[PDB]
């Protein structure tokens, strides 16, 4: 075999990178356009400071990572290694973020 790292094991290498580093894992410019787009629905004629966009990203990173960490415990309870939108929908309900 051409020394292909196992699909299960490639996560472990990716684990040690993100568990050791502090960074932002969402593209900035696509997020910049998305944040500017959702504003038009509620309030048009608006500008956006760079600090405001970064702060919105920082909340998003912690929101999803906390969702991912809690959803993993949902998967470990369901006897499956994989997380599923079944668990994510439950995670939003129990955390109170669904409504």
């Amino acid at each position: 075999k051409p020394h292909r790292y196992r699909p299960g094991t490639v996560a472990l290498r990716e684990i040690r990178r993100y568990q050791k580093s502090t960074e932002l894992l969402i593209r900035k410019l696509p997020f910049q356009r998305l944040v500017r787009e959702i504003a038009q629905d509620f309030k048009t004629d608006l500008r956006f400071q760079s600090s405001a966009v970064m702060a919105l990203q920082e909340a998003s990173e912690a929101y999803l990572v906390a969702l991912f960490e809690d959803t993993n415990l949902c998967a470990i309870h369901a006897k499956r290694v994989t997380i599923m939108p079944k668990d994510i929908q439950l995670a939003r309900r129990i955390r109170g973020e669904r409504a």
Binding site: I38, L56, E97
Partner: protein, 86 residues
């Protein structure tokens, strides 16, 4: 030759972006349906924050949104961000 009004606004969060956040949670692999769901849960989360953020901005009678308004929105929502302070 040219495509229409816009693209990648909400689809700009591709599979690696979700996977990198998934690798942050410790998981190994995902089902394929998460990618549409993660974009959806991101959209509702931003909408809740951005609704509060523009509300402060409108009260300030300015057309620019600052991090202070975002912090105020996040602090009240239970998602307080201690960064980007004075």
């Amino acid at each position: 030759r040219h495509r229409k009004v816009l693209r990648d606004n909400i689809q700009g969060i591709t599979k690696p972006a979700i996977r990198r956040l998934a690798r942050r949670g410790g998981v190994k692999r995902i089902s394929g349906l998460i990618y549409e769901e993660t974009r959806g849960v991101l959209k509702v989360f931003l909408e809740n924050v951005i609704r509060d953020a523009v509300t402060y901005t409108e009260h300030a009678k300015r057309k620019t949104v600052t991090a202070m308004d975002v912090v105020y929105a996040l602090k009240r929502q239970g998602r307080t961000l201690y960064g980007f302070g004075g």
